[PDB]
């Protein structure tokens, strides 16, 4: 418990920069039916089914749009991976390897992968000598399509966004600047005069290349953080497989009468099957959804809330690409530390009452300083910190100090 | 009207404190059916209705969740009461009664209170020699469950609320102040200097003694500002009754026919209960998110948003526990006795435009002052209130007048 | 592209305001049917469609008052249309014509304007000589229902929201103060201090003014942002129409049996104007809570996001009425001539490094200075825009020049 106190304030003395990671699934297999395979305005059963697995397939696009695509100026490449200490070289994409992701994208797209449909599909659609119509034709009408967005150009949207991130603040107002000259305006935003910054800043980048040299540590060795991501792809790979396998072995199972059931069979498993890619569609769309909100107020500025944008106070964030998903790079400051001194409202001199310009008064038992008071940088009290309004009888708690005209 | 001008500014030099009630419902009473009155995978009848009223029950611990449990570390009791003048004796616990309820709080629970099943339910309910199943097999079938955050766990959260609001304020950022300071910062955040509270501190708080005396004088001796949490009791404890009017008169009212007419009359008398409580559902769970969003915005923080938080500009916010609801105490401000000054964009001096660091320039008619804006506290134009930049020609409605240097 | 930098800084040397212009509409033609030209309990079929159009209807009442009646509070007429060299004349109502409309106003209500039924049930209502039920009579039943709140009604919202953004700013706080010293107020919210609008505010009102001028010189010549207007009006008279057609064509088309089927196809052709109906206000629901939102973000307040409230960084907005709908006459500022200078963290001098108190420090190539971050206007380096703290050996990049104690 801390209590109550009419005489002191607690103030922090030391902080700690933290890099943590949020996953976020915002995409779905989009599957479609060749219901000829189950002017052609309408079939009367099969159709039904298949326009809905229409409506969420654009559902999918809908959703990694609106989480990717919300920024287009293209900040060039940076690309030297330094920024006054901060070490970005696990964060920045590299030609070295031709596919241009970030080390750490490598490593989701490595830890999440895929006997099964969406296997099967992949390894029957050769970019040649395969077409859709011919493997609708091969598996029985259920195909998998492609995505409006692929990794590459996701991966592009997250490299314009890392860019646009380290040049500039997005957002008040927006202009390129340095990036320690940036982190200066972030720890202002907290509350934090700039100048804790520039004289901390081998600390502060010490402590963030150790965060996030542990980020990629842990993904691969300790597994238990890309679960939310395993699920999305396994799930909805099993729920194609129990579909076709009741289209597959249930044909030896279940004339015109017995044609009537086996057919209708399908089709019920086919709404088996759809009814729970609409459910799924429910989480990937409010998983996607919290991801484009968090874009805009985790990456493209600098969150107000707490514990939102990663725990503590947040500084800033940074996305990466994942199979049908973003991760979330937060980076946050939280304060250590934390001290109790003994405060005063108003500081009395020659007779008049003399407040803080910005800050609190505090004492270390046997003088008065003037203090910031989101962390503990003292100063001597002077007529350019202070302003000086009242008389020192009018004040409640006030407390008699010198103060000084340099 | 208040009409244009040019050549003025409206600045008030008074104004007064206000503690304002908002009353806002959470929870509503959990109902539930034991079927086998009216491995059991399920009942084809009563299971549809009573899997429903399970879900609007567990919606009420949800909602009683979202709106209490919204914070938990503690900050130990106050327990003063007297906060720089301020009388805190109205709101805070106090073990000098066991129940440690605040002694509005107590007269929350005194005025929303209870021939009626949810009396007869409880007077049947021993809490020992009666058990669930004994008053389901006493009474036909129908129950009210136990909340899970009972009224002195939700008294708890209350007193955490308020330590945590006293001791500190909810961000920012957040940590802890004696409370005459963080009001301060609260008039900082409406707009006007810290320097304003300390000097009118004992007027302001005898204006806020003021009103919360006049809060509690009016809820019991005028009982018109309770009817929204005695409307939520009453009328659901009217549908427990209309229920049971008709699962025990028409007994004798409406073999295998005349029963399948009888079972099914109770259960068109459930479908009517049921369909009612899940339309009162959408008021209580409007009602609760509501006071969750107010939690967050009023108690803890302080508004932007204007007669939200309580009328006039807010200030800060308490809360206070009822029967199913929770009293939010909105202290605001509100500035009075507004008055037109003359005003100036620049002042003249030396061939130079000088512009307020901050504030606005006003004269009495005679002389020259640099103010705030949003309060009437005059100074004296000097070099350390004033920025420089510009010529006194290319600028539109400057004004003439001396500019000292201390 | 723009690319990396560590050792400079981009900053705007100028600036230009830009008047733009958006359209949405709020409400729709309010149908109300007479089921018996189609204790009166309740008619079994027609009663059905006619209460879903009775529920749009007060729907239509309901936008237009969230859109429209926000704010109620009179600011008298202002009404002198010059305000500093802004030239308020197309936008403020007169008294000269004796609608009382804006000249805008005036040509949205030309352009968005009206062998159909909104034409011959008015042409039908006389306001003499005819009432609701003998045109109920002469034309079979269908029926538009008055407004709630009329044209000059909304018109009298729009000049009071118009006084109260013109006389003051709605919040913060709010309290009435000239307008380009309001304006001066809106700079300081983009982040551009407040001196550099009264030193440059007849290049602002030129700006404004020529703008404005294009505005009204587009909406009649260049039609083609009027269309989204056009389209509420014509398309639910066409609806209008194309039910009339079937319930008066279909006299001669399509005994009990006959009557039967005649009767159920002029309910189904009201289905088919009922569903369209309510489908058509899923889109005047979503434009009149965009308008709402918009309402209290660009008019009553200034908006923190960008391309939101008009494209470029919001400065305030201006409201003009519009058959069934509102326009935003959003004011908005945009830099101009980015260029990048070489910039520094501190300035070292005497052995202390300096930090500036608001701004970057930047130079020419010869020498440094001290500068708002977001407008190029540089300063020379002082004691008074410098805070000192520290060392010139523990910061990074700091640089050294001399700084000056006037």
């Known amino acids: 418990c801390v209590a109550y106190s009419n005489n002191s304030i607690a103030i922090p003395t030391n902080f700690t920069i933290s890099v943590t990671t949020e996953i976020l699934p915002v995409s779905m297999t989009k599957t479609s039916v060749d219901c000829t395979m189950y002017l052609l305005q309408y079939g009367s059963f099969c159709t039904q089914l298949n326009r809905a ?33 901060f070490n970005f070289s696990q964060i920045l994409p590299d030609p070295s390897k031709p596919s241009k992701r970030s080390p750490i994208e490598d490593l989701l797209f490595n830890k999440v992968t895929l006997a099964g449909f969406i296997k099967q599909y992949g390894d029957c659609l050769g970019d040649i000598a395969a077409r859709d119509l011919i493997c609708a034709q091969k598996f029985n009408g259920l195909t998998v399509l492609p995505p409006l967005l692929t990794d590459e150009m996701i991966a592009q949207y997250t490299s314009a966004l890392l860019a646009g991130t380290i040049t500039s603040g997005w957002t008040g107002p927006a202009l390129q600047i340095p990036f320690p000259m940036q982190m200066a305006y972030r720890f ?51 729920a194609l497989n129990t579909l076709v396998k009741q289209l597959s072995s249930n044909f030896g199972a279940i004339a015109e009468v017995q044609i009537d059931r086996l057919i209708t069979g399908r089709l019920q498993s086919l709404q088996t099957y759809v009814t729970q890619q609409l459910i799924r569609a429910a989480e990937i769309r409010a998983s996607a959804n919290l991801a484009a909100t968090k874009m805009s107020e985790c990456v493209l500025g600098q969150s107000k809330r707490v514990d939102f944008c990663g725990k503590g106070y947040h500084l800033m964030s940074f996305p990466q690409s994942a199979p049908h998903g973003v991760v979330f790079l937060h980076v946050t400051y939280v304060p250590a530390q ?38 503990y940088e003292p100063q001597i009290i002077t007529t350019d910190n202070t302003f000086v309004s009242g008389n020192c009888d009018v004040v409640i708690g006030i407390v008699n100090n010198t103060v000084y005209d340099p």
């Not at 697995?53 to 919300?70: C, M, S």
């Not at 409202?345 to 505090?362: M, Q």
Request: proline letters at 4%; glycine letters at 8%.
């Open 53 to 85: 697995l229409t409506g969420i397939a654009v559902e999918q696009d809908k959703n990694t749009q609106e989480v990717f695509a919300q920024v287009k100026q293209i900040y060039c490449t940076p690309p030297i991976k330094d920024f006054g200490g």
């Open 188 to 238: 202002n935003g907290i509350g934090v005069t700039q100048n804790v910054l520039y004289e901390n800043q081998k600390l502060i980048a010490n402590q963030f290349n150790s965060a996030i040299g542990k980020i990629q540590d842990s993904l691969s060795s300790t597994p238990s953080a890309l679960g939310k991501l395993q699920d999305v792809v396994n799930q909805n790979a099993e």
């Open 338 to 375: 934390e001290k109790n001194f003994t405060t005063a409202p108003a500081i009395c001199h020659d007779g008049k009452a003399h407040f803080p310009r910005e800050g609190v008064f505090v004492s270390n038992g046997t003088h008065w300083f003037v203090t910031q008071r989101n962390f």
